[PDB]
Enzyme design. Structure first.
Site, PDB file in Angstrom:
ATOM      1  N   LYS A 158       0.866  -1.150   0.000  1.00 46.01           N
ATOM      2  CA  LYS A 158       0.000   0.000   0.000  1.00 46.01           C
ATOM      3  C   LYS A 158       0.891   1.183   0.000  1.00 46.01           C
ATOM      4  N   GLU A 184       1.995   4.072  10.921  1.00 44.60           N
ATOM      5  CA  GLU A 184       2.968   3.449  10.071  1.00 44.60           C
ATOM      6  C   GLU A 184       4.006   2.770  10.904  1.00 44.60           C
ATOM      7  N   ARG A 185       4.546   1.644  10.383  1.00 45.62           N
ATOM      8  CA  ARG A 185       5.454   0.787  11.098  1.00 45.62           C
ATOM      9  C   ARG A 185       6.760   1.508  11.022  1.00 45.62           C
TER      10      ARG A 185
END
Lengths: 234, 91, 187
Positions: A158, A184-185
């Site tokens: 994504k 977000e990671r």
């Protein structure tokens, strides 16, 4: 003027209730700061519950809160800094310079709660952005000032799709961009930071045609909610 | 006596049936003490200029539903009763 | 445990007052002072009969208390702590509630029993007295336990009688017998 003193009454996860001084309630959507051994915990006033006892949402971790801990009142909606030197900074929820290139050079500050534009102001455009991506160009052309939506499932690259968009349209276009990452990671974050440092859209001396608000999922859910709001104000 | 006089002094002495005061405001659900002359869903105007309807009439409080934005409403706020149930221009 | 366990809705407060002042032994005194302030509250019409219900602050509530204890220079000190409690919990609606409950406990300490003799209409005093005598004579009223008997008018019941006291009743009514008669002639 005199910060309304509040005493914590209940730490019930993110919800932290404060007992502000009588005859003065910091209004709904204000920002309270509590000086803590780890920075200043920001509590966003989200309800008034009676007799100067508010129920507020935390914007930072709730460890080591001592019951009845003095709570200063900033007095108004969480106000981030805005400027053109906010470009090329990583700015956290409460507006901290987590850019790590040291303190953001504030011009102005603005609240992160703002009322959406009126019907009269809104003027509907009809001009075509084009990404050069075949599927996009033929079967779903994008439009200037648009609200494009990348619906998809888990990890369909994504972020990768967005990165492609940044590679094409952002570098090309003269306008500013705002990159906002909500939960977000930090793997994805480091890649994005590096990638846009590499593409020079964040130029370490030069001007940056993007600003960053990297919101990390480890940050409390409350803080995660107002990552979006921060980005909007920029 | 002197106590009763001082008691009268520290009391608002509001008509308090026209005339409400917010008890607590959360989630756009102001809960008002007063407004005894209220008729259900009737238009009430806060002193923030916010307008509301009174979907819940409850014995202790009247649960106004705010038509405005919650950030402009704060406790103890006088709530005059516009006194005309929701009506819109027709013509 | 202290005589009579009521434990009402905020009657745990009353219980607390009862047992705490019972060991002070100033329960009659407490009760009297509470009655005196309760009466002057009832005879205070603006506020505390028109702001009996809250909407006041903590600080304003406290200042309402200060005026209340200004009126009485004899007010014990356990009920001044009770006033503090009520201020702090910001309940004033359960002021008369506690008064009634403390009264029940108090008159339990006194050993006064209560009863009622509901009838359709209010009846003769000669009947009242004969019944009061009878009830005191009966084992229903214990010795060292006083009787308060109240005839009430309960026109809801037409004819008949019910004697009530100590949650034990004798109901010699017309209505039940009529009901039973009707039922048996519907058999």
């Amino acid at each position: 003027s005199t910060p309304i003193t509040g005493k914590v009454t209940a730490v019930i996860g993110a919800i932290v209730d404060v007992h502000f001084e009588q005859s003065e309630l910091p209004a709904i959507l204000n920002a309270l700061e509590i000086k803590t051994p780890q920075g200043k915990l920001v509590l966003e006033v989200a309800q008034h519950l009676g007799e100067n006892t508010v129920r507020t949402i935390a914007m930072d971790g709730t460890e080591g809160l001592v019951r009845g801990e003095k709570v200063l009142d900033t007095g108004g909606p969480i106000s981030v800094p805005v400027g053109r030197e906010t470009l090329g900074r990583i700015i956290n929820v409460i507006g901290e310079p987590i850019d790590e290139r040291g303190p953001i050079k504030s011009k102005l500050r603005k609240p992160i709660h703002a009322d959406p534009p009126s019907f009269a102001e809104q003027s509907t455009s009809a001009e075509i952005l084009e990404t050069g991506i075949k599927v996009v160009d033929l079967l779903a052309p994008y439009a200037r000032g648009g609200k494009i939506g990348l619906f998809g499932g888990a990890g369909v690259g994504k972020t990768v799709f967005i990165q492609e968009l940044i590679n094409n349209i952002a570098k090309a276009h003269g306008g500013f961009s705002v990159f906002t990452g909500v939960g977000e990671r930090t793997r994805e974050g480091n890649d994005l930071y590096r990638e846009m440092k590499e593409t020079g859209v964040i130029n370490l001396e030069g001007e940056s045609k993007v600003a960053l608000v990297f919101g990390q999922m480890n940050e409390p859910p409350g803080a995660r909610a107002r990552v979006a709001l921060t980005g909007l104000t920029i | 006596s002197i106590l009763e006089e001082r008691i009268k002094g520290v009391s608002d002495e509001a008509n308090l049936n026209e005339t409400g005061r917010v008890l607590a405001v959360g989630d756009g659900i102001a809960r008002v003490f007063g407004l005894n002359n209220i008729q259900a869903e009737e238009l009430v105007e806060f002193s923030s200029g916010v307008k509301g309807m009174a979907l819940n009439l409850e014995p202790g409080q009247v649960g106004i539903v705010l038509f405005g934005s919650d950030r402009l409403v704060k406790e103890g706020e006088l709530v005059k009763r516009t006194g005309n149930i929701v009506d819109v221009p027709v013509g | 445990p202290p005589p009579v366990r009521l434990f009402g809705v905020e009657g745990t407060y009353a219980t607390a007052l009862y047992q705490a002042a019972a060991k002070n032994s100033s329960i009659d005194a407490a009760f009297q002072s509470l009655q005196k302030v309760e009466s002057t509250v009832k005879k205070n019409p603006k506020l505390g009969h028109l702001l009996l219900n809250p909407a006041l602050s903590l600080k304003d509530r406290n200042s309402v208390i200060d005026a209340i204890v200004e009126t009485h220079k004899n007010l014990d000190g356990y009920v001044v702590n009770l006033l503090k409690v009520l201020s702090e919990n910001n309940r004033l609606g359960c002021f008369e509630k506690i008064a009634s409950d403390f009264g029940v406990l108090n008159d339990a300490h006194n050993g006064l029993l209560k009863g009622t003799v509901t009838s359709a209409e209010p009846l003769d005093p000669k009947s009242f007295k004969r019944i009061e005598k009878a009830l005191s004579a009966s084992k229903l009223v214990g010795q060292g336990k006083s009787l308060k008997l109240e005839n009430v008018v309960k026109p809801e019941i037409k004819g008949g009688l019910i004697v009530e006291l100590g949650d034990k009743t004798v109901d010699l009514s017309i209505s039940t017998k009529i009901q039973k008669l009707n039922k048996v002639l519907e058999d």
